Structure 1
Amino acid sequence: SVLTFQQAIQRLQDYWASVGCAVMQCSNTEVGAGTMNPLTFLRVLGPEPWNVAYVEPSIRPDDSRYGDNPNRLQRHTQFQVILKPDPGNSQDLFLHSLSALGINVREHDIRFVEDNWESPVLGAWGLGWEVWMDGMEITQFTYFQQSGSLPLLPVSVEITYGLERILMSLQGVDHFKNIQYTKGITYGELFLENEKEMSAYYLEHANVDNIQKHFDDFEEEARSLLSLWLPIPAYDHVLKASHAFNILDSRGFVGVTERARYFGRMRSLARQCAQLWVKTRENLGYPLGTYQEKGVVGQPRAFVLEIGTEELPPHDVIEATKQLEKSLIQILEKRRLSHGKVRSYGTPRRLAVVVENLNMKQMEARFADEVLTEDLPTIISGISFPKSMRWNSNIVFSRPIRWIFALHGDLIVPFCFAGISSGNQSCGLRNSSLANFKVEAAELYLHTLEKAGILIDMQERKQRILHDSSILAEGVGGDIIAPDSLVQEVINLVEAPMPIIGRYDVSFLALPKDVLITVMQKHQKYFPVTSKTMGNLLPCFITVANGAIKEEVVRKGNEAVLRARYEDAKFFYKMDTQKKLSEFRDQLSSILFHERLGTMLDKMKRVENTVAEVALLLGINEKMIPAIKDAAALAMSDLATNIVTEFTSLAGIMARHYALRDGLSEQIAEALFEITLPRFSGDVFPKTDPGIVLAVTDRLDSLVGLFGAGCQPSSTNDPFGLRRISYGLVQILVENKKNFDLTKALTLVAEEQPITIDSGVIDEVVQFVTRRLEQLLVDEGINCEIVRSVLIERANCPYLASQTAIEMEAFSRTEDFPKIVEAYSRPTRIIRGKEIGSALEVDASVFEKDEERALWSAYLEVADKIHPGVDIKAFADASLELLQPLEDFFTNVFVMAEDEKVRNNRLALLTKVASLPKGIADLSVLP
């Protein structure tokens, strides 16, 4: 017999008590999570240590499903663990807790996947993970950085279990009602009627007027109690205000603007309770405690640096390894240290760089060990992330650094960082024979990792993932659908890829194929499988497990998770079948785009009113406009559907499906899907003309409106995703070979905006988009300056500019290029500052030497063969006709003649010569 719910509670309490926690009781006032319990929100504040564990019934009125959905609950049961300060081995304590539940962590696939917890109501945030057990989210795990808008010291670790989820996964039940609570009694027998009636209360019957006035009374009493220096009752009243607001929300009486003001009042009161609680603890003397904290130079040997971390997000692994390699190479150069090949490797738990054949000393001079002892700490410090965190010091990092391996040949490079000393020791796969190992020479590093089951090269990981998954899918007569985006994510969610094929119920094949593929890929990171013969989805998937796990266990686990996910999808689909897409569209007024911009419905009305002119500027025939406008009237209405509010990754897909299911046009349904493409780096692009028009218009509208709203992105904060929005816009225009007048269309949508848009806002957007086009072309493999020189003159049409960039990278290698460039550079350099040359017309009657008329005649013919819009080939070939005339001119004509009229005529001539490249490229940047 498998574990019962109350058995799980008892075992978690016993376990965490054996580690030194106090097993407490739940809040006797309604909280949405154990985090809101004073045992968490207040006790993380100040320096006093705090190690506690308690069950918490968490009440989220928004999740009321009357018990009808197999997994959604207005009351679920968290197990809340706070450890303060961080003991340093919190992950291991949690895995030990799992074993205490009878779980075999070796056979199961326990994964730490990025998920950062934050709370506006509480003014709190941290960084950490969601923990998957065989693909089931069972625990949120967080290093708390800030609470009550106060920075935290020491940092606490929060481990929050979802007991319903864990029991459903361990018992293998598909509905929460059938969880074994104790022998003979199921979860449903105790709680289904509660779920039913409490849902009825939260969604339909609660008196919203009295509850709003009660919210006000609670605010007033909280302020009163704070002013009386009584934080405990005051925060109690803050919790009551939060529950009241949650009920007003679930009843649907929080308007879209009121929401932020409500959160602001709750946050203000919470910050005040926090500061008052800290003052109170201070006045008490912090009674629970306080917190604190030669020979003959030899041959070049290999140098290995490995920073071991707790699981980093994939983006963080990529960018950390890039930065580490660049920084180390630069420092090695600046320190006269020579070396061979340099290669960097990454992994959720490790960042490594290998320098082959690193010299023992510098040129001209200390040993490399000394130089590195002093430069490596600031190299690691130099690594930066969009989000970092403290854990036991002032040092920040994406996730905690737990070991540091640094070896030059046979010798440790000694240094400290983040309170970690360097050594010759590393960690393998958890719960394995080489969970800890030591390497006695850098040249033995990779070998030893290979002996520990870790494939540290991300490309070898890609190859094994793909090869093994394809073998598995061929075994059932199928092919994996494994886009590179998802493969890239999976590569950095594992260290020892182990693909495993599992099955799902064929009943779910009755769901739309795009729905199953999206659920699989974007929510479970599974590879779908399609038949090699029929071209249809086989009821199969591949999961890339990590480590030496038991195939059978992991398979059944993930199978149960996927069944639950498809059941959620089926539930919300059936909920949507009753209405028709047009009925949903009016509920776009329930979603804020931005306070000073309006709802998604305001946004759509804007899009409708600009879509036809965007179409004409794209040069699509005047005959597709009606349909475009038609599609514009139904765009992103699926944002209001239940399925998309549950699965945000189905926007566009569901608009298409619910449109076809209404007999609407195939091309209109495709337009409704295309307006969202590309959805992510790797996605496909809109390919149908009205889809192109819709997508382009929506991106222009977001850009102009958000930039005029002051949401111009920064180096690290782009909450609205403007950078990828602009990148995708230029990508859409290039891939579909669409000529565009960027400034014209941006002014076009600038007129439709609810706010006033300046010419300066439009110029801001044009520059932002141009820089993303530069990024694109330097990412597709075009030289930097060759791109800049083109974009200076042709950025206003992204597709023409792209073409021109490629053509001049061809130009760049053709022998004549340098001579054409010099030909144009000399007149440009001479006429700099002499605006007189731009103010005069050349007067051929002022010529004095035949070389002047020769140059003038040649210029006039070349000006005829060169227009703004010409291809580079014609430009270069026509510029060839100036070479000899210009050489003759510069050998026999004195440019700075002492007669002002002749000198000015000569400057004007050189000015017209230098003006030919205008609107093609600016050779002032080219080599």
Structure 2
Amino acid sequence: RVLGPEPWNVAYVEPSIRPDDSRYGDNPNRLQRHTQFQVILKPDPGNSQDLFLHSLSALGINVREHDIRFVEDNWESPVLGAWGLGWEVWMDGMEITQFTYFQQSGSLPLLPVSVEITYGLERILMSLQGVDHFKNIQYTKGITYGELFLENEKEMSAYYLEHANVDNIQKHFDDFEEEARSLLSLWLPIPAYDHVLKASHAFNILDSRGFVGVTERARYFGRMRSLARQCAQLWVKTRENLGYPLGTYQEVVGQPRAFVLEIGTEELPPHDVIEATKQLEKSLIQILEKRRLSHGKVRSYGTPRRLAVVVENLNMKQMEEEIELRGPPVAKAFDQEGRPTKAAEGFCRKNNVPIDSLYRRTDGKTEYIYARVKESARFADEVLTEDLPTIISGISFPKSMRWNSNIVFSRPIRWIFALHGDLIVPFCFAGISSGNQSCGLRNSSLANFKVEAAELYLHTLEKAGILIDMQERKQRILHDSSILAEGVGGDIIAPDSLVQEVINLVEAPMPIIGRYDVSFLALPKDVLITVMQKHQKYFPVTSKTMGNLLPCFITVANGAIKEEVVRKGNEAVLRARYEDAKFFYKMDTQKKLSEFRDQLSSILFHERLGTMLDKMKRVENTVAEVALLLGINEKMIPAIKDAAALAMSDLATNIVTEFTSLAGIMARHYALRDGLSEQIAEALFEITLPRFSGDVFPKTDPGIVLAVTDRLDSLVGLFGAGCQPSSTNDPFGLRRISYGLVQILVENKKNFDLTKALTLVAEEQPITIDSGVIDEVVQFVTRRLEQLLVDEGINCEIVRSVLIERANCPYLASQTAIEMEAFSRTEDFPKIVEAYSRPTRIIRGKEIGSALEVDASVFEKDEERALWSAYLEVADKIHPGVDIKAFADASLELLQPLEDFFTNVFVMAEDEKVRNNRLALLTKVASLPKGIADLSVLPGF
């Protein structure tokens, strides 16, 4: 009932049962059956998030005292085929509610869009009551929540988890599927959807029991997606054959003054402020001067809910000067006794100057009749009315919404404040008429004010608390955090990829210190800081003497905050996330690390080639040779192989399934603790480097072998088994995987062979690899090397004349392409590029049959006896792997006997048989540079 034109304001309460989250009722947060509260509003009323905050203080919360935050989180579900954009609501660190605008459902777009608010009533009641474990929540006066739902939590888990008969469910799945597919032919949507409901249930208690393998999930999701995809198209029609019984949705001259334009919004993401406070100022800078208007210091600003721009002392009229303008040539328009044909009139009509006010000028060919024009001063406030809406509509985001019309933006626009001097610039955009009002800090005494003159805008804004200048929020975060961190004895850890995302989550910052327990310090350091940074957005604190962690953290509130309830509320969320990660860790140190391999066989890699255990199986059997292609020392080929079986073992651990960014850290941590060598453990970490664009590369010796051998397999397998990247679409990430393999080499001084390693790591795969499909992987790698090499300030014509035969070993190519440009800029390049061109053109094909023929059989020539000597004494130096400088000094002395041979000897055949000496003697001199550079492409030939 969100599909159609039908208005549907409704709100209900329902439990929700998901069995794979059943944990016998012991961990205080996860339940197999939890109550929700759902409210859907269609159409969107407009107050849709000022009714929410009345709801909160209705259920007894003090919203001027706690810290309510709208942190963005999109929503998508492919099974139903729906998605939407919106936020989640953090009260004092706890995520309590989701808030979404819908845009797809089934597979047909929505009109009008719906608003979905979904409270979760057991994560709210533990916070509002000071309780850590759900079985202490007071249900009513006298009875507890545990004493009602505990054994249902306890023994429905044993059913969904161990004793669920798993074939009388595999049959019921297909039975329900068939019945729902049949009742979609008598045109009955209601039961034909209830059967989809009770089939997608029976799939969950299959998945929980583990009976679903790894390759059946892609089939089950498909089987059940096209049932919801085609119940929708039946419902939306059976509605309209009734006639929609619930209505239908249809719809002056003076000195210069400043000019300020703000576009209020609802909370934008943290990185849609940065890429939208630029393509607005640029798009304004252009159009201010395109229309002949002069100004001064233009300056942008940003906040999660406004995007302001200020242009100072803007003009009051256009510049109003007369400019020349030339039109069509005298050939097209002008003619003898036929001057106005069809073009002269079109050239004067759009300019309305009289037709006898034209003259001629030597415009190249003394043509292009023309005249003058006027600029038409237009008061600088009726100009902007025409050009602002196309400014504001210009900004473009990757993800975008619709709320009440077909206009698209990233979040709904709520107010527009655009003024100039004292007067308002009047226009309208997306149903909002511009004015001079603005909302300050929400839920304050200045939640609505009006600014009179545009020169006291900023001074009024920061009179309501807001700090809009983005670069003066960083300096009030990182400078009131230091006093706190030094009051306890330490200092903060602020990677500037976290400050750029803490700045744009706040409007008027306020920092607070908090304490967590000391007995959590036994965890690894890089799980503490990852909990405190990548999920909660806190600041850790490290004692600057003996620089390890302390039991403190720093959090950033927003506004007029009680700062006695928010510290106490934040201290008790990462007393729970730590308390879960500690249980996971203690469950992971129960077994030696070498046993976590045999769980790997339940992670999919690719369908027709398999899991991850087989892939890591196909690497121990080849990492004993890629250490010979790289020329690794002999006394380390043992110490690599035992660190190759343990590789990628931590990917089945309990932690790494929860914190999927610690793949690689929590393998070295276990390995060192188990009692391996140091270099084994350190190599167990760089099988993952680099993880993205711009990360450290493997430096140790056994760290390169594995990081190369993995990237060879994930290339040859994915290529020779269907998934080729031939598209703009990038599945399986075949671009960065191929890009990193050349950086691990050019950054590490290694000599490799791309056409021998790919003839040996393809031999192993399960599917057959023919010699033709590895000749495209070499090209897909060489193009990536060329792109890496061009954008280092290199010239484009030399990197295509070294990559013809030095393209195999990616280090020597990147070595000899930088060393060739510096030689190309010196004044010996035109001597050599010609010296080698006189004997490669002259031999464009004359049936040289006797292959070698270089002999003194009959060499009765004069200059031959002095040319072949030079060829031998240079060819004795140039070996197939020499550098470019020995070449560039060994050909300069060969260039002279060339012009002493061509001067006299008549190479072409005046005799019948003996004219092949004179041909081979130049074929050889032409072929010497085969292996160093392909000299027949460079210009100047």
Shift of the alpha carbon at 1:210? 0.3
Q: CA deviation at 1:746?
A: 5.9
SS of the aligned residue for 2:299 comes to: strand
CA contact (8 A) 2:794 2:821 kept: yes
Rate the CA distance shift 1:368–1:120 in 2: closer, same or farther, 3 A: same
Q: Which SS does the other structure have where 1:382 is aligned?
A: coil
Q: Deviations over 1:202-251 (max 9, x none)?
A: 11010010011111111111112222221111211111111110000000
CA distance in 1, matches of 2:809, 2:313: 49
Are positions 1:827 and 2:839 aligned together?
yes
Equivalenced residues, count: 883
**1:609 pairs with one of 607, 617, 621:** 621
Residue range with higher mean Cα deviation, 167-176 or 252-261: 167-176
Please state how far the C-alpha of 1:48 moved relative to its aligned partner. 0.7
Partner of 2:260: 304
**In terms of mean alpha carbon deviation, does 727-736 or 250-259 score higher?**
727-736
Q: Quote how far apart the aligned CAs of 1:582 are.
A: 2.6
Q: Tell me how far 1:633 sits from its aligned partner.
A: 1.7
Structure 1 residues 700 and 491 mapped into 2: Cα distance closer, same or farther (>3 Å)? Answer: farther
Equivalent-residue separation in structure 2 for 1:836 and 1:357 (angstroms): 81
- Answer yes or no: is the 8 Å Cα contact 1:143–1:155 preserved in 2: yes
Query: How far off its partner does 1:270 sit?
Result: 0.9
Moved more, 347-356 or 116-125: 347-356
Aligned-partner Cα distance in 2 for 1:258–1:805 = 50
Distance 2:636 2:85 in 1: 49
Counterpart Cα distance in 2 of 1:835 and 1:325: 68
Contact 1:789 1:922 in 2 (8 A): yes
CA distance in 2, matches of 1:105, 1:910: 91
- Match status 1:654 vs 2:610: no
Give me the whole-angstrom Cα distance separating, in 1, the residues matched to 2:292 and 2:936. Answer: 35
Q: CA deviation at 1:255?
A: 1.0
CA contact (8 A) 1:837 1:908 kept: no
* Structure 1 match to 2:346: none
The equivalent residue for 2:754 is: 742
Q: CA deviation at 1:181?
A: 2.6
- 2:708 and 2:729 map into 1 onto residues whose CA distance is 24
Q: Look up the SS of the partner of 2:596 in the other structure.
A: helix
The 3 A distance-change label for structure 1 pair 494 and 587 is same
Shift of the 349–205 alpha-carbon distance from structure 1 to 2, 3 Å rule, reads: same
Shift of 1:482: 2.1
Q: Indicate if the aligned counterparts of 1:169 and 1:560 stay in contact, CA closer than 8 A.
A: no
Tell me if structure 2 keeps the 8 A contact 1:837–1:907. no
CA contact (8 A) 2:28 2:132 kept: yes
TM-score, scaled to structure 1: 0.78
Deviation string for 1:714-760 (max 9, x for gaps)? 99965645555556556655665666666765666555555566889
**Closer, same or farther: CA 70–660 of 1 in aligned 2, 3 Å:** farther
Task: Give the Cα separation in 1 of the matches to 2:453 and 2:840.
Answer: 59
Q: Which piece of structure 1 moves more, 477-486 or 305-314?
A: 305-314
| 1:680 counterpart SS class | coil
Q: Distance in 2 between matches of 1:349 and 1:320?
A: 12
3-state secondary structure, aligned to 2:802: helix
Give the SS at the match of 2:849: helix
Give the deviation of 1:63 after TM superposition. 0.6
How far 1:396 moved relative to its partner?
Answer: 2.8
* Cα distance change of structure 1 residues 222 and 491 upon mapping to structure 2, 3 Å threshold: same
**Residues 1:479 and 1:786: Cα distance change in structure 2 (over 3 Å):** farther
Give 1:550 shift: 2.8
**Offset of 1:278 from its aligned partner?**
1.0
Q: Compared with structure 1, are the counterparts of its residues 366 and 639 closer, same or farther at alpha carbon in structure 2 (3 Å cutoff)?
A: farther
**Residue matched to 2:606:** 594
Tell me the distance in 1 between the aligned counterparts of 2:817 and 2:307. 36
In structure 2, do the counterparts of structure 1 residues 121 and 386 end up closer, same or farther at CA, with 3 Å as the change threshold?
same
| Range with greater deviation from structure 2 (403-412 or 603-612) | 403-412
Shift, 1:154, TM fit: 1.4
Instruction: Tell me by how many angstroms 1:472 deviates.
Output: 1.9
Partner of 1:327: 283
Q: CA deviation at 1:381?
A: 4.1
Greater displacement, 120-129 / 765-774: 765-774
Please tell me whether the aligned partners of residues 485 and 681 of structure 1 are also in contact (alpha carbons under 8 angstroms). Answer: no
The Cα shift of 1:827 comes to 15
How many Å separate the matches in 2 of 1:193 and 1:64?
12
TM-score (norm 2): 0.77
Worse overlay, 216-225 or 496-505 = 496-505
Secondary structure of residue in 1 paired with 2:580: helix
Distance 1:437 1:907 in 2: 92
What SS does the corresponding residue of 1:112 show, helix, strand or coil? strand
- Give the deviation of 1:553 after TM superposition: 2.1
1:172-192 superposed Cα distances (whole Å, 9 cap, x missing partner)? 322222223333333222222
Per-residue CA shift, 1:865-885, capped at 9, x if unaligned?
999999999999999999999
CA deviations on 1:469-524 (whole Å, 9 max, x unpaired) are: 33322221112222232233323333333332211111111222222122212222
Is 1:804–1:871's contact at 8 Å kept on the other side of the alignment? yes
Matches within 5 A, 1:352-431: 352-354=308-310, 372-407=384-419, 412-431=424-443
**Alpha-carbon deviations, 1:615-674, whole Å to 9, x = none?**
445554344333333233222222222222222222222222232332233322232233
In 2, Cα distance between equivalents of 1:485 and 1:862: 57
SS in 2 for 1:819: helix
1:825 and 1:369 mapped to 2: Cα distance? 68
| 1:837-864: CA deviation from partner (whole Å, max 9, x where unpaired) | 9999999999999999999999999999
Residue 261 of structure 1: how far off its partner (Å): 1.2
Superposed CA offset, 1:122-172 (max 9, x none): 122222223222222211222111112222211111112222222223323
* Residue-by-residue CA offset, 1:74-101 (whole Å, 9 max, x unaligned): 1122211111122233222222222223
2:476 to 452, 457, 464: 464
Larger deviation, residues 177-186 vs 856-865: 856-865
What is the CA distance between 1:459 and its match in structure 2? 3.8
1:259 CA displacement:
0.7
* d(CA) in 2 for partners of 1:352, 1:850: 84
Quote the Cα distance in structure 2 between the aligned partners of 1:93 and 1:824: 82
* Mapped pair 1:484 → 2:496: yes
1:60 deviation in Å?
1.2
Choose which of 660, 679, 692 in structure 1 pairs with 2:704. 692
Deviation at 1:770, TM superposition (A): 7.3
Where 1:760 maps in the other structure, the secondary structure is: coil
Match of 1:195 among 104, 129, 153: 153
Larger Rg: 2
* Residues 853 and 916 in structure 2, CA contact (< 8 A), matched pair in contact too: no
Which secondary structure does the structure 2 equivalent of 1:144 belong to? strand
Provide the rounded CA distance (Å) in 2 between the counterparts of 1:911 and 1:498. Answer: 79
Q: What's the CA shift for 1:117?
A: 1.5
| Matches of 1:270 and 1:329, distance apart in 2 | 49
Unaligned runs of at least 5 residues, structure 2: 320-375
Q: CA deviation at 1:798?
A: 6.5
Give the superposition deviation at 1:327: 4.2
* 1:801 paired residue number: 813
Deviation at 1:197, TM superposition (A): 0.8
Give the conservation status (yes or no) of the 8 Å contact 1:495–1:547: yes
**Aligned with residue 778 of structure 2, among 751, 766, 776:** 766
Larger deviation, residues 787-796 vs 157-166: 787-796
After TM superposition, the structure 1 stretch with the greater mean CA deviation from structure 2, 693-702 or 713-722, is: 713-722
Contact in 2 for aligned 1:59/1:76 (Cα 8 Å): yes
Distance 1:446 1:281, change over 3 A: same
Per mean C-alpha deviation after superposition, the further-off stretch among 503-512 and 684-693 is: 684-693
Check the 8 A contact 1:823/1:886 in 2, yes or no: yes
Contact 1:869 1:919 in 2 (8 A): yes
Shift of 1:542: 1.7
Distance 1:667 1:854, change over 3 A: same
Q: Distance in 1 between matches of 2:437 and 2:905?
A: 75
Q: Using the alignment, how far apart are the partners of 2:849 and 2:425 within structure 1? A: 64
Could you say if the C-alpha distance between residues 791 and 360 of structure 1 is closer, same or farther in structure 2, counting changes exceeding 3 Å? farther
Deviation of 1:415 after TM superposition, in Å, equals 4.7
Give the unaligned 5+ runs of structure 1: 1-42
After superposition, the Cα gap between the structure-2 partners of 1:495 and 1:739, relative to the gap in structure 1 and judged at 3 Å, is farther
Deviation, 1:119, is: 1.6
Q: Deviations over 1:674-712 (max 9, x none)?
A: 323344567655443333433344344445544566666
Quote the Cα distance in structure 2 between the aligned partners of 1:722 and 1:425.
51
Return the offset for 1:426. 4.2
User: Residues 411 and 510 from structure 1, CA distance in 2 versus in 1: closer, same or farther, beyond 3 angstroms?
Assistant: same
Structure in which a larger fraction of residues adopt helix: 1
